[PDB]
């Protein structure tokens, strides 16, 4: 999945213009993603790891 360009994007829009993008046709290993402590906040509602 194109997470590299999402995390390394130069410019982001304002709060009133939050971007919505469909994530599909790609496979990523979220396990390593949530195994790290890089993200200050990681909260899941309605699902379990």
């Amino acid at each position, epitope marked *: 999945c194109p997470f590299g360009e999402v995390f390394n994007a130069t410019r982001f829009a304002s709060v009133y213009a939050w971007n919505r993008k469909r994530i599909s046709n790609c496979v990523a290993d979220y*396990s*390593v993603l949530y*195994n*790290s*402590a*890089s993200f*200050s*906040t990681f909260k899941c509602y309605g699902v*379990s*790891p």
Partner: antibody, heavy 86, light 98 residues
Framework: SLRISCKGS????????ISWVRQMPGKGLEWMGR????????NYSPSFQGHATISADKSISTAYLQWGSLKASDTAMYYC?????? | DIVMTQSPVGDRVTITCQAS??????LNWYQQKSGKAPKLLIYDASNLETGVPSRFSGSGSGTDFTFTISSLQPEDIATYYC?????????FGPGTKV
């Protein structure tokens, strides 16, 4: 549900580190996690399984602990005290 | 995933630390007392945080590291944990309990 709270007073909570200790009877020291208020740095135990996570509220100086799925080993007493200065 | 395996009063006891890949000198050490919690003392193996005694030192490079006590003391009983960090994340080992 059961909630356990341990709130200090008379001193700056953000200026004094707070750590949690888990020790059920018949076992040794099993650390789980510590938080750095400056950057929310979380260090995990060597035998971590993603059971419980620590969170704090700077607005009200209150720390909350929740369990994703309570099990038998969660029934234990916890040690809380003011830590070393800085 | 990545799987890691480790083998195996006053006697010579030596422990080793292993990592999935080469970590150069990016190592961490812990100090544990009877009633106390583990605390970060040295980070990057080149900066001594204020208040930490200077008697603690390390040597070696690459994939082999050794821990040696110059003089064992009754107050020196502790369990040491080894932590490594890389550009991807943080991986922990089972460790050894005394």
């Amino acid at each position: 549900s059961l909630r356990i709270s341990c709130k200090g007073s008379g001193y700056s909570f953000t200026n004094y580190w707070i750590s949690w200790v888990r020790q059920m009877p018949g076992k040794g020291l099993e650390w789980m996690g510590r938080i750095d208020p400056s950057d929310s740095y979380i260090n995990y135990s060597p035998s971590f399984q993603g059971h419980a996570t620590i969170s704090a509220d700077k607005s009200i100086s209150t720390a909350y602990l929740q369990w994703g799925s309570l099990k038998a080993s969660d029934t234990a007493m916890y040690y809380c005290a003011r830590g070393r200065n800085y | 995933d990545i799987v890691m395996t480790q083998s195996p009063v006053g006697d010579r006891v030596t422990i080793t630390c292993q990592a999935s890949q080469d970590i150069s000198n990016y190592l961490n050490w812990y100090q544990q007392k009877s009633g106390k919690a583990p605390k970060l003392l040295i980070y990057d193996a080149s900066n001594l945080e204020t208040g930490v005694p200077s008697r603690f030192s390390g040597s070696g490079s690459g994939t082999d590291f050794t821990f040696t006590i110059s003089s064992l003391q009754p107050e020196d009983i502790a369990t040491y944990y080894c932590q490594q960090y890389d550009s991807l994340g943080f991986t922990f080992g089972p460790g050894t309990k005394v």
